[PDB]
């Protein structure tokens, strides 16, 4: 039929379009016991499928650390900052501000069903969540927040699992 | 006194007030644009116990059940106060009309009370503590904490 190259190209274009449109289908917000709000799948996702972008304010590490030192003065702020490496620098998606975007509401597990990856579009990095296994309708979406800090775990013991 | 001694004395005052349900130094008033509110009738000092957020303590299954029912009746107000305790979601549902005053206190992000979780031998309570000296005659206010887009769209007073 088509070559691997053609299939990969057409797949990447579909992902680019989902990122650009901000379409966030197949998900609903629910209250999750012990976790606050979370996001539930309303349809099946297959392993490797695009689930959602982790969408918010893209900023650089120095700016992020400054914002965070201010947030730390107000214990009510909550933790919505997602730091990552892109090429030879470090960036952050700061999703502290409440929006209708769902990525920022997804909770943590070390044995979840989503994996975050970098998807750049013409030199602009995007953090996207991909299904790491098939996901059933009704499942809570979960991924590994990746914070191994002793101090973080002491204050947020749910990070342990 | 040591920190521990001061903490024990505070815990004891708070436990006594939770027990008695005494709600002195407050009254209900109509506040323009807010419905009822609660106003101080005496000065409160920073750190003082003000009131318990008192209602039906329930877990998440019942809270969700009740939410779904309340949502079907537009005349029903919003009195459900959610919190985390021992890795579970709890809710003080103060929807039923009672004589208790915590349920009537209005919202501000720059108010004069702060809600704390206070545990008595494994039973959680939500209590309001004065975050600054509170003048006689001024409205009691605390941060409701719902910052969600879905809520602020419908209730813009949440933004301030």
């Amino acid at each position: 039929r088509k070559s691997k190259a053609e299939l990969q190209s057409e797949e990447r274009k579909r992902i680019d379009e989902l990122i650009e449109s901000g379409k966030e289908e197949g998900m609903k917000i629910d209250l999750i016991d012990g976790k606050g709000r979370g996001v539930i799948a309303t349809k099946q996702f297959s392993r490797g499928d695009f689930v959602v972008e982790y969408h918010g304010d893209l900023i650089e590490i120095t700016d992020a650390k400054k914002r965070e030192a201010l947030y730390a003065q107000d214990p009510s702020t909550g933790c919505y900052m997602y730091y990552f490496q892109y090429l030879s620098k470090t960036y952050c998606v700061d999703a502290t501000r409440e929006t209708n975007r769902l990525g920022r509401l997804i909770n943590h597990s070390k044995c979840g069903n989503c994996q975050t990856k970098l998807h750049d579009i013409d030199g602009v990095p995007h953090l996207i969540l991909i299904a790491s296994r098939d996901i059933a309708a009704g499942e809570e979406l979960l991924y590994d927040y990746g914070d191994r800090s002793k101090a973080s775990i002491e204050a947020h013991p749910w990070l342990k699992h | 006194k040591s920190k521990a001694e001061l903490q024990s004395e505070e815990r004891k005052r708070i436990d006594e007030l939770i027990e008695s349900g005494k709600e002195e130094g407050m009254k209900i008033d109509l506040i323009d644009g807010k419905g009822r509110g609660v106003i101080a009738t005496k000065q409160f000092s920073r750190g003082d116990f003000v009131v318990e957020y008192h209602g039906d303590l329930i877990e998440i299954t019942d809270a969700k059940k009740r939410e779904a029912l309340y949502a079907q009746d537009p005349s029903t107000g919003c009195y459900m106060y959610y919190f985390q305790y021992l890795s579970k979601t709890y809710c003080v549902d103060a929807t039923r009309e009672t004589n208790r005053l915590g349920r009537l206190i209005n919202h501000s992000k720059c108010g004069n009370c702060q809600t704390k979780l206070h545990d008595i031998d494994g039973v959680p309570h939500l209590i309001l503590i004065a975050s600054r000296d509170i003048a006689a005659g001024e409205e009691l206010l605390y941060d409701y904490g719902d910052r969600s887009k879905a809520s602020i769209e419908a209730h813009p007073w949440l933004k301030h």
Binding site: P75, G78 | C78, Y81, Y144, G145, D146, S151
Partner: peptide, 8 residues
């Protein structure tokens, strides 16, 4: 149409 009160 409803908001919550939420401990933070």
């Amino acid at each position: 149409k409803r908001h919550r009160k939420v401990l933070r």
